[PDB]
């Protein structure tokens, strides 16, 4: 239940705003406010060019 790391700092107001390459999760959504993303990502697969 207790958040740690960057999320923990934001929850405990130690870090006001957050900066980092962290994706969007529902658990974080309930404890912080997710801003508009600046780049996209997701479940991707990489294969050898061959």
């Amino acid at each position: 239940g207790t958040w740690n790391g960057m999320i923990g700092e934001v929850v405990m107001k130690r870090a006001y705003m957050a900066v980092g390459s962290l994706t969007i999760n529902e658990e974080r959504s309930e404890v912080v406010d997710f801003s508009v993303p600046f780049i996209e990502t997701g479940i991707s697969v990489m294969v050898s060019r061959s």
Partner: protein, 48 residues
């Protein structure tokens, strides 16, 4: 903005103007931008 319809559902981009006028939620679908042409039928040009 005139109050005719309540909620909008449509694939509309989010520029600065309408964002200033009204806020938006998370983007349900990512997208990019591309030119489209009806290719070309492969043909070798030469006389004889």
């Amino acid at each position: 903005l005139s109050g005719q319809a309540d909620m909008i559902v449509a694939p509309l981009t989010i520029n600065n103007e309408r964002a200033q006028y009204i806020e938006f939620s998370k983007p349900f679908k990512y997208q990019g931008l591309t030119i489209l042409v009806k290719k070309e039928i492969p043909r070798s040009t030469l006389d004889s």
